[PDB]
Design a protein around this motif. Structure first.
Motif, short mmCIF file in Angstrom:
data_model
loop_
_atom_site.label_atom_id
_atom_site.label_comp_id
_atom_site.label_asym_id
_atom_site.label_seq_id
_atom_site.Cartn_x
_atom_site.Cartn_y
_atom_site.Cartn_z
N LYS A 270 -6.12 1.47 -5.93
CA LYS A 270 -6.55 2.79 -5.48
C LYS A 270 -5.62 3.87 -6.01
N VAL A 271 -4.31 3.59 -6.03
CA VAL A 271 -3.35 4.55 -6.56
C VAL A 271 -3.60 4.78 -8.04
N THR B 86 -0.52 13.92 -4.06
CA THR B 86 0.80 14.42 -3.68
C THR B 86 1.43 13.57 -2.59
N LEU B 87 0.61 13.04 -1.67
CA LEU B 87 1.15 12.22 -0.60
C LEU B 87 1.84 10.97 -1.13
N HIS C 35 3.47 16.77 6.04
CA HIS C 35 3.75 15.37 6.32
C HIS C 35 5.13 14.93 5.83
N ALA C 36 5.76 15.68 4.93
CA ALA C 36 7.04 15.29 4.37
C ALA C 36 8.23 15.75 5.19
N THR D 60 0.84 -1.18 0.00
CA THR D 60 0.00 0.00 0.00
C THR D 60 0.88 1.24 0.00
N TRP D 61 0.39 2.29 -0.65
CA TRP D 61 1.10 3.56 -0.70
C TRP D 61 0.26 4.65 -0.05
N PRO D 62 0.89 5.66 0.55
CA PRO D 62 0.11 6.75 1.17
C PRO D 62 -0.54 7.61 0.09
N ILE D 63 -1.87 7.60 0.05
CA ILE D 63 -2.62 8.25 -1.01
C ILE D 63 -3.74 9.14 -0.50
N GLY D 64 -3.92 9.26 0.82
CA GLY D 64 -5.02 10.04 1.34
C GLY D 64 -4.71 10.61 2.70
N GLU D 65 -5.67 11.38 3.21
CA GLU D 65 -5.59 12.00 4.52
C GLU D 65 -6.88 11.74 5.28
N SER D 66 -6.75 11.50 6.58
CA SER D 66 -7.88 11.28 7.46
C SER D 66 -7.59 11.95 8.79
N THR E 26 -6.63 6.95 -8.37
CA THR E 26 -6.32 8.32 -7.97
C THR E 26 -5.55 9.06 -9.05
N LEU F 291 5.51 10.57 -0.51
CA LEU F 291 6.08 10.17 0.78
C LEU F 291 6.79 8.83 0.68
N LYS F 292 6.33 7.95 -0.20
CA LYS F 292 6.95 6.65 -0.42
C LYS F 292 7.74 6.58 -1.72
N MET G 5 -11.86 10.01 4.48
CA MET G 5 -10.74 9.82 3.52
C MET G 5 -10.74 10.91 2.46
N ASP G 6 -9.73 11.77 2.50
CA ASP G 6 -9.54 12.83 1.52
C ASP G 6 -8.34 12.46 0.66
N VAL G 7 -8.60 12.06 -0.58
CA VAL G 7 -7.53 11.59 -1.45
C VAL G 7 -6.57 12.73 -1.75
N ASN G 8 -5.28 12.41 -1.77
CA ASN G 8 -4.23 13.42 -1.96
C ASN G 8 -3.09 12.77 -2.73
N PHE H 287 1.33 17.86 1.93
CA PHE H 287 2.52 17.05 1.72
C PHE H 287 3.73 17.63 2.44
N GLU I 78 -3.48 8.05 5.15
CA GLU I 78 -4.19 6.85 4.74
C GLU I 78 -3.49 6.21 3.55
#
Lengths: 677, 486, 740, 24
Positions: free
Chosen positions: B405-406, C6-7, B483-484, B388-394, B409, C10-11, C1-4, B480, B399
RNA sequence: AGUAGAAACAAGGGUG
RNA sequence: UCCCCUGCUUUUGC
């Protein structure tokens, strides 16, 4: 008839008469391109916009009387309105389709001949054979490759001349074809293109495409050949390789070169193996040249080379005659000899035993750049006649001749520091070591050889110690004539035996070939040489070597871990760790290996002190024999491009850095995969 | 002569010594506390500006065994209209502030009347022309271009002045764009794209490619972004074809899309209608005006600011059957005037390539992982969802989503880039790429350095004016950055 | 869940997901109205960055000119145009020292090229300015008009056809006291003779047509570009040839290299700077950019560089090479089309030409435009703005690259004479730099030294968009290096689609693009197959060539259905004819016609590949199977595709708006030319393959060839005596009519 | 292969406001 | 009104 | 007002 009538009507008008009579043939190139139509700025948008119009295409006025004005569905096909700036009419796309279903049919037999390149492509593709897909890291190097399976080694000017001769013979001009290749090609195309209705310009363009060598900078990972680059999109990928051999009867020279390169690589890699013969056989049975297994090529390819000959001898096949030495093949025309071990003192004050050949013998030496004849006695050369191409070739030939002479003047001429034992105490052939050090510099060697005037017989030229062609004086027993080729090719295949260390001895017992003779020229394979093995990607760079070995350790960490825990010895002697050892400095190699092992030993004796990453980083070093020492190594060095990069025993290093947060290992900035706790 | 007899005599060193010390490139260290969040513009909330509704759209569907582009659009629209019972007398709920709403009401009434007229004709033409009524003349900008005269004949006019060339008014970021993106990133229960055929696989690599392609097509065909792609492509194709063909009359263009439901039954869906105006398009940027009326179930009174350019009518009530039972909800119609250019339409017909973008980024992502394992991981990638890759915020934290999902997106991001194209987006992306690279270098502890960071920040910020999409992108970049660097 | 999305960075490292940051699926920004504002702003900026110079009044054109060369040294980091002659000469001398014989060999090659270049070489341009009509015209048309005017004005030095002869003719024309031009006015087609005095023609020959650049990616604001007239193009050609010859021998020059070789050079430089240096030597990389590249470059400095390069060379060669900088120094820029004024109360709009901006009331314009006009008024001569400094057009791309490469070469340890040193690559205005020094202080010192040297020579490093980091990753002209060049696919996304040449060419280009992106841009197999599917769908929709099986209704559907029902081997039909798609990864490189040559019916095969069909027309060879494709970034390139000449190789229709202007007459003339040229093809079959050469007129060569061919044909016995006699009589008729 | 999402809720998204069922 | 954004489109010309 | 013309052609460099 029609042409002159058209010219008459053209001169009928006044403005046209002015145009024709006041513009020079040279100026045509200017007025022929005279147009008000601007170059297209958005061809895609223009095409989309125009395709919705009723008449978006242009056609010759002849269409007016070739297809009906309206379809059977009362659908108008062409319009009377003329296209802007010309006499062409405006027609709908439907007309084209009409022609494709109701137009006049014509014979199409020259098309496969005229468009020979495309049909060659399709024929080659249909007869190709595919193989397994290998999922492995691909290293692509950007290089200039020639994309033209078919070309006759012609440049733009020669290609244009040939094309003009074939297509427009009456307009060729003053040029006359001389070389046989051009005449043959012209005759072939003339007979083949006879009675062709295709437009001459298309024929000329296709001939230019077929007879001109094109090149391009591409990222290539496999064989760099015209027929292999053509299918690069299908064979090479980011993380996969698709075995494929085009159905085009791969050239004999290409397979010879590929086999030579593969043989050099395999012998070089096996020299470091614990059991060179076993590794040689195993990797010869797991390597393919252009989609064909290496062993089959060996048993069917009549090629001459030191490495391929060593491979053949290992397999148990016939070996080439003559005797290879210093990169030159000596054929004994007459005479005989017996080997005797003689103890002599070298110019550097070294006592050593050398195998001398007794009696008087005559040999002819063949080389890729020089051919010569040598008549010699026991430790005394009678005469040498050299025919080298350039000065350096003649230098190497004379040096090799006098080195084969076994003269004590050569032995005493040694100066400086010379080591006859390799950096890892591997005994080296004294003869080859002398050859190498004399190739390094022979000024002192020549100054200590002697002088002799020549009688100027048959125009043979002399040679001076400073390497100039003297006529009144020459080096002792050396003449230069520069003939073409040797007396005759030698094809008397003989059977020999191969020692455990890849030493080839004759039936009597005379050594015929050795690993030290392999040329170090690192070329690039013409055909796709597949080194399908556990870890045999040495053709890649050293950084690639390190990354791949660490990735392999990560991939097979389960069996690697169990082997390390139970029987570390079998893990250490793996064929996979040897390429890594090839980069570690030789002198310190053992000093590292045993040291690493000691740590492992302690880590075996203390439960709970299991640092996974430590084992991962230190495993490749412990593949060499352990030399015990009390030195405490903080870091170990690896040679990459001649630079010593350090990997720290404790802590992060730039060559090897594992991030805990991402749980990922990166080596030299390249991801090595993900580790598990 | 001076140049010929010239020899280098310490000229550069002397000049450098003469030059002042203020002319220097001082390296500013880029630490974790150095970067700051982008300053978003302030002002009224941004309003929807897409050429059609995205998440509030509603469609009337009929089961039709026809493939894409097969049936007559007008007949499909008529059948879909017939499928719905429960019409009502239109009345204005949320009016267009700067417009003549009664003209919109009359436009809808005229559309219904023309639909009935064609319905009682028994012969459906490929295209239907709408009468040039006063309401359609106004709504389509008829005779709104000022007369063109020579300067000498109007140089004395008191108010004659240069065209308005001021900066676009600024608008703050509104939360509806994030909801739009979330909806566009979701999985649908019906396929939306049916790709054509290709040659048979003969090589093993072709078989691997076909398997991976089956996986990707399954993942992408069930994405709402694919529905948006198909709708936009159809709308732009119809608009361009009508504009080129009939550029003097008002044409009625239904909005239709063909889909396949999870039971395998084909469906044709009607979203609304579009009436194009005169389309004598000469320059690539020449604008053709049209009036779009789209069905919806969304009440505009919840987010009025989102519908500044829209006039919303109440055109009926619908009895929606839910799991528990049936419920009656009002059926709204969003009517507005929009415009499009030749270049915009052309780039609207090529939205399908958006897919490729995401897919490419996905494929390279899988292969990079497969290169270090020596086995195709696609099936292992998104049949077990191990990676899984980080693709969202909660509210709890970042998230993570599966590679599917990626892919969805990235497809949604490309689609929104296509649908919200503007110079602001181009500039913001180009300028923020450098800041992203600097942050990446900092993360790789490569001792990054900047010569003028404030200048880069100013260049980035000057591109955020009023576009909701670029404002959302800037907000994402701020998140970002937050969080980065923690 | 707010898709982003850009995040995702991070990986995945940014360089590995850089394609996510390229929004190239949307339409690019365009320019709607006039470019006068941008041109005026550019002129003001150019004269502002070098305002501390010498003001002079040209004695020939009578226009103000600014000379910032050898001006005061910069005191701040703002852009400067004060380039020092001595510093640039020193840089050139040191470059010559580092690569001995480079200038000599390059000059020898250029002298060889110059004497062998034909005038027709100038026909290979794009929308050059035309002083005779005072508007942009295609290169061939502009050249023909200039030649016609020169011939009418008693200037026939270009009859030889050599380019140098045309340059001599241009010089002679500039020496003329008066010029005669022909103008077309319709009120009915009427022709007028207009006489231009020396100053007017001189200004016109130094005039540059300015417009606004559209479809540019990554920029919020539009900018202006310029195109020169036919007078200076000839000299610029030789200057560019010399610069290219110099650059081909420089390893640090990124031109004329393009694509993969540039990446190879960058990788080689990076490895040379990193691996060779010891771990003790710190190394850093600057991915910088140069600001106002074309505004701070002075034609005088290029004149000095050319003078130094051509040392110890024949005088004529030096003159011809150095004239182009001289022409660029005294250059005038046209101020676009003008402006548009509008009255709301009276509901009116009107166009005000730029020529009237000199003495027009300022009450109409807004604050910014009024300020620009007030600041540019002094420089306006004959409706054009005088612009001595800068290189707005930027035709000296390669000379600028040479200057940048010289500055880079000035970084060798022997020239820096200190611990730190630098090396890198320079392509036009872009550069990647690498500085090696023992410590961080040394790195800063080297960066400062490079920046100050660049400022001294006239090159300004944009501190705002540049950054420095450990030499492990960098960027260069959208090529992203992260321990290796990672391919980004977004840049080529616009290329995926129906090009718009024709059915066959479009199919070939689409498949070739898919294959090339597989080879270069790391396009995966599955993605390649999906791209093939999408391209086929788009192609079918664009050309209305859906499969005959489907019932999609289009104007072309009926014919496609009839053909589909008529053929038996339905697999052999071309996709243009509603056939199936047989393409796959393996056969992406095979043209469609050959890909299924064996599956086609004999009748269908004969009909399709019929050379007698009227739809196919062949121009000069260089245009055969060659198309012009403009990428997202950079200039228009020429793409070669594989295709068979079939009925699907038609040409689309031409624009007809010219029929409603005063320039309609040229259209008629064009037709006439084609007629004559066509008749030449029937007479000289090889004419289109190789350009003919000859001083003789058309009719003379035509009649000679006619007589000789007639005699040969009659001798062969292929023609009866009556036909030979008739053609000989008609040839005599033609010869006599030639005299009257 | 049937795509699925952990965020797909079977009860919260009632009657599918975008593409509902209204046939009587 | 709308598109759109540093300047434009919201048709432009011609004839009776 | 009918009718005729026009849909990149006063504006896309290197």
């Amino acid at each position: 008839m029609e042409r002159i009538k058209e010219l008459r009507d053209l001169m009928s008008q006044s403005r046209t008469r002015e145009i024709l009579t006041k513009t020079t043939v040279d100026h045509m190139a200017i007025i022929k391109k005279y147009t008000s139509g601007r170059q297209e700025k958005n061809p895609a948008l223009r095409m989309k916009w125009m395709m919705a119009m009723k008449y978006p295409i242009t056609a010759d006025k002849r269409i007016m009387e070739m297809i009906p004005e309206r379809n059977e569905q009362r659908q108008t096909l062409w319009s009377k309105t003329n296209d802007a700036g010309s006499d062409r009419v405006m027609v709908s796309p439907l007309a084209v389709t009409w022609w494709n279903r109701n137009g006049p049919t014509t014979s199409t037999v020259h098309y496969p001949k005229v468009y020979k390149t495309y049909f060659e492509k399709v024929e080659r593709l249909k007869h190709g054979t595919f193989g397994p897909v290998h999922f492995r890291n691909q290293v692509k190097i950007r290089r200039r490759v020639d994309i033209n399976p078919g070309h006759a080694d012609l440049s733009a000017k020669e290609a244009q001349d040939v094309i003009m001769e074939v297509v427009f013979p009456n307009e060729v001009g003053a040029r006359i074809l001389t070389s046989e290749s051009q005449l043959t090609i012209t005759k072939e195309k003339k007979k083949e293109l006879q009675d062709c209705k295709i437009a001459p310009l298309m024929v000329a363009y296709m001939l230019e495409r077929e007879l001109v060598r094109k090149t391009r900078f591409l990222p290539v990972a496999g064989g760099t050949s015209s027929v292999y680059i053509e299918v690069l999109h299908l064979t090479q990928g980011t993380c996969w390789e698709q075995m494929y051999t085009p159905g085009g009867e791969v050239r004999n020279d290409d397979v010879d070169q590929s086999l030579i390169i593969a043989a050099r690589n395999i012998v070089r890699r096996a020299t470091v193996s614990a059991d060179p013969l076993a590794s040689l056989l195993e990797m010869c049975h797991s390597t393919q040249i252009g989609g064909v297994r290496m062993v089959d090529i060996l048993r069917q390819n009549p090629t001459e080379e030191q490495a391929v000959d060593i491979c053949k001898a290992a397999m148990g096949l016939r070996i080439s005659s003559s005797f290879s030495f210093g990169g030159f093949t000596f054929k004994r025309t007459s005479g005989s000899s017996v080997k005797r071990e003689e103890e002599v003192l070298t110019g550097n004050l070294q006592t050593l035993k050398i195998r001398v050949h007794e009696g008087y013998e005559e040999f002819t030496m063949v080389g890729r750049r020089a051919t010569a004849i040598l008549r010699k006695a026991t430790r005394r050369l009678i005469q040498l006649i050299v025919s080298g191409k350039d000065e350096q070739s003649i230098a190497e030939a004379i040096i090799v001749a006098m080195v084969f002479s076994q003269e004590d003047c050569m032995i005493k001429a040694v100066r400086g520091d010379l080591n006859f034992v390799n950096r890892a105490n591997q005994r080296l052939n004294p003869m080859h070591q002398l050859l190498r050090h004399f190739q390094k510099d022979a000024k002192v060697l020549f100054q200590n050889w002697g002088i002799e005037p020549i009688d100027n017989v048959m125009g043979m030229i002399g040679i001076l110690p400073d390497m100039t062609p003297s006529t009144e004086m020459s080096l002792r027993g050396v003449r230069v004539s520069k003939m073409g080729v040797d007396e005759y090719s030698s094809t008397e295949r003989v059977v020999v035996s191969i020692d455990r260390f890849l030493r080839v001895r004759d039936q009597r017992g005379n050594v015929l070939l050795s690993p030290e003779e392999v040329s170090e020229t690192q070329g690039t394979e013409k055909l796709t040489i597949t080194y399908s093995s556990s870890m045999m990607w040495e053709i890649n760079g050293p950084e690639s070597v390190l990354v791949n070995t660490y990735q392999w350790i990560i991939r097979n960490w389960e069996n690697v871990k169990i082997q390390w825990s139970q029987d570390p010895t079998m893990l250490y002697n793996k064929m996979e760790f040897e390429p890594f050892q090839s980069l570690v400095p030789k002198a310190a190699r053992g000093q590292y290996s045993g040291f690493v092992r000691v740590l492992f030993q302690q880590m075996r004796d203390v439960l709970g002190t299991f640092d996974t990453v430590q084992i991962i980083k230190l495993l490749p070093f412990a593949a060499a024999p352990p030399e015990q020492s009390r030195m405490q190594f903080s870091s170990l060095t690896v040679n990459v491009r001649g630079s010593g990069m350090r990997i720290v025993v404790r802590g992060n290093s730039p060559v090897f850095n594992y991030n805990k947060a991402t749980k990922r290992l990166t080596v030299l900035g390249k991801d090595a995969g993900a580790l598990m706790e | 002569a001076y140049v010929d007899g010239f020899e280098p005599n310490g000229c550069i060193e002397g000049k450098l010594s003469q030059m002042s010390k203020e002319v220097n490139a001082r390296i500013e260290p880029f630490l974790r506390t150095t970067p700051r969040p982008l300053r978003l513009p302030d002002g009224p909330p941004c309003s929807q500006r897409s050429k059609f509704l995205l998440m509030d759209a509603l469609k009337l569907s009929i089961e039709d065994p026809s493939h894409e582009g097969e049936g007559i659009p007008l007949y499909d629209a008529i059948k879909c209209m017939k499928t719905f019972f429960g019409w009502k007398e239109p009345n204005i709920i949320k009016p267009h502030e700067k417009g003549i709403n009664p003209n919109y009401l009359l436009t809808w009434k005229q559309v219904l009347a023309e639909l009935q007229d064609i319905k009682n004709e028994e012969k459906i033409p490929r295209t239907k022309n709408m009468k040039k009524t006063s309401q359609l003349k106004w709504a389509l900008g008829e005779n709104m271009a000022p007369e063109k005269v020579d300067f000498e004949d109007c140089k004395d006019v008191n108010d004659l002045k240069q065209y308005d060339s001021d900066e676009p008014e600024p608008r703050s970021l509104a939360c509806w764009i994030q909801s739009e993106f979330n909806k566009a990133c979701e999985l649908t229960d019906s396929s939306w794209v049916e790709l054509d055929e290709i040659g048979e696989d003969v090589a093993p690599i072709e078989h691997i490619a076909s398997m991976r392609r089956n996986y990707f097509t399954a993942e992408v065909s069930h994405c709402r972004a694919t529905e948006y792609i198909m709708k936009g492509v159809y709308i732009n194709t119809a608009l361009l074809n009508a504009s080129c063909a009939a550029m003097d009359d008002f044409q009625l263009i239904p909005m239709i899309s063909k889909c396949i439901t999870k039971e395998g039954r084909r469906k044709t869906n009607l979203y609304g209608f579009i009436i194009k105006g005169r389309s004598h398009l000469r320059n690539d940027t020449d604008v053709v005006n049209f009036v779009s009326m789209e069905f919806s179930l969304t009440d505009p009174r919840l987010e009025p600011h989102k519908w500044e350019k829209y006039c919303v009518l109440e055109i009926g009530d619908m009895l929606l059957r839910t799991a528990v039972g049936q419920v009656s909800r009002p059926m709204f119609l969003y009517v507005r005037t929009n415009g499009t250019s030749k270049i915009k339409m052309k780039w609207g017909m090529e939205m399908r390539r958006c897919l490729l973008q995401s897919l490419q980024q996905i494929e390279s992502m899988i292969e990079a992982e497969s290169s270090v394992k020596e086995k195709d991981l696609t099936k292992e990638f998104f049949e077990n969802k191990s990676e899984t890759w980080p693709i969202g915020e909660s509210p709890k934290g970042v998230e993570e989503g599966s590679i599917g999902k990626v892919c969805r997106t990235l497809l949604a991001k490309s689609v929104f880039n296509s649908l919200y194209a503007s110079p602001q987006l181009e500039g913001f992306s180009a300028e923020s790429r450098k800041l992203l690279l600097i942050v990446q270098a900092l993360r790789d502890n490569l001792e990054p350095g900047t010569f003028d960071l404030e200048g880069l920040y100013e260049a980035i910020e000057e591109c955020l004016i009023n576009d909701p999409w670029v404002l959302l992108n800037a907000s994402w970049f701020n998140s970002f950055l937050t969080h980065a660097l923690r | 869940m707010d898709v982003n999305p850009t995040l995702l960075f991070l990986k995945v490292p940014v360089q590995n997901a850089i394609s996510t940051t390229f929004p190239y699926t949307g339409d690019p920004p365009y320019s709607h109205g006039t470019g006068t504002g941008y041109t005026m702003d550019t002129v003001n900026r150019t004269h502002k960055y070098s305002e501390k110079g010498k003001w002079t009044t040209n004695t020939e054109t009578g226009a103000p000119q600014l000379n910032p060369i050898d001006g005061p040294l910069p005191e701040d980091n703002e852009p400067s145009g004060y380039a020092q002659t001595d510093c640039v000469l020193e840089a050139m001398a040191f470059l010559e020292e580092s690569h001995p014989g480079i200038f000599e060999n390059s000059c020898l090659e250029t002298m060889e090229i110059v004497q062998q270049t034909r005038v027709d070489k100038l026909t290979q341009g794009r929308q050059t300015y035309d002083w005779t009509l005072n508007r942009n015209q295609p290169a061939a048309t502009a050249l023909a008009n200039t030649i016609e005017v020169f011939r009418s004005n008693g200037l026939t030095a270009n009859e030889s056809g050599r380019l140098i002869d045309f340059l001599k003719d241009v010089m002679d024309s500039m020496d003329k006291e008066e010029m005669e031009i022909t103008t077309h006015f319709q009120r009915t087609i009427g022709k007028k003779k207009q006489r231009l005095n020396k100053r007017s023609y001189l200004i016109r020959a130094l005039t540059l047509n300015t417009m606004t650049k559209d479809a540019e990616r990554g920029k919020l604001k539009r900018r202006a570009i310029a195109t020169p007239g036919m007078q200076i193009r000839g000299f610029v050609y030789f200057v560019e040839a010399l610069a290219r010859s110099i650059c081909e021998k420089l390893e640090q020059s990124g031109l004329p290299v393009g694509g993969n070789e540039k990446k190879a050079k960058l990788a080689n430089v990076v490895r040379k700077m990193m691996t060779n240096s010891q771990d003790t030597e710190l190394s850093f990389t600057i991915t910088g950019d140069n600001t106002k590249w074309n505004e701070n470059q002075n034609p005088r400095m290029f004149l000095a560089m050319i003078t130094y390069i051509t040392r110890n060379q024949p005088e004529w060669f030096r003159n011809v090479l150095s004239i182009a900088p001289i022409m660029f120094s005294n250059k005038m820029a046209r101020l676009g089309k003008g402006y548009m004024f509008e009255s709301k109360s009276m509901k009116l709009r009107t166009q005000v030409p730029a020529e009237m901006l000199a003495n027009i009331d300022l009450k109409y314009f807004n604050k910014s435009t009024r300020e620009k006009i007030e600041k540019i008024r002094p420089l306006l001569i004959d409706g054009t703005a005088s612009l001595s400094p800068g290189m707005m057009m930027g035709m000296f791309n390669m000379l600028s690259t040479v200057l940048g490469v010289s500055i880079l070469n000035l970084g060798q340890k022997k020239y820096t004479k200190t611990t730190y040193w630098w090396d890198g690559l320079q392509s036009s205005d872009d550069f990647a730099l690498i500085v090696n020094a023992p410590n961080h202080e040394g790195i800063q010192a080297g960066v400062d030294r490079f920046y100050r040297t660049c400022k001294l020579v006239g090159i300004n490093m944009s501190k705002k968009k540049s950054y420095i980091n450990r030499t492990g990753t960098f960027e260069f002209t959208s090529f992203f290096y992260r321990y290796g060049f990672v391919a980004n696919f977004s840049m080529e996304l616009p290329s995926f689609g129906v090009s718009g040449i024709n059915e066959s060419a479009d199919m070939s280009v689409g498949v070739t693009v898919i294959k090339n992106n597989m080879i270069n841009n790391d396009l995966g197999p599955a993605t390649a197959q999906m791209a093939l599917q999408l391209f086929i769908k788009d192609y079918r929709y664009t050309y209305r060539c859906h499969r005959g099986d489907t019932q999609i209704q289009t104007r072309r559907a009926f014919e496609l259905g009839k053909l589909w029902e008529q053929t038996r081997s339905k697999a052999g039909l071309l996709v243009s004819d509603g056939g199936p798609n047989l393409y796959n990864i393996r056969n992406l490189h095979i043209p469609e016609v050959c890909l299924k040559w064996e599956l086609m019916d004999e009748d269908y095969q004969g009909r399709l590949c019929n050379p007698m069909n009227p739809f196919v027309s062949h121009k000069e060879i260089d245009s055969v199977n060659n198309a012009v494709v403009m990428p997202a970034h950079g200039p228009a390139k020429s793409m070669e595709y594989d295709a068979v000449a079939t009925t699907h190789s038609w040409i689309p229709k031409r624009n007809r708006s010219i029929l409603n202007t005063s320039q309609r007459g040229i259209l008629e003339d064009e037709q006439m030319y084609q007629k004559c040229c066509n008749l030449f093809e029937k007479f000289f079959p090889s004419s289109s393959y190789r350009r003919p050469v000859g001083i003789s007129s058309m009719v003379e060569a035509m009649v000679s060839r006619a007589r000789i061919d007639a005699r040969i044909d009659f001798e062969s016995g292929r023609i009866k005596k009556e036909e030979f006699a008739e053609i000989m009589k008609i040839c005599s008729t033609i010869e006599e009519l030639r005299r009257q | 292969y049937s795509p699925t999402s952990p965020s797909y809720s079977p009860t919260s998204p009632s009657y599918s406001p975008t593409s509902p069922s209204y046939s009587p």
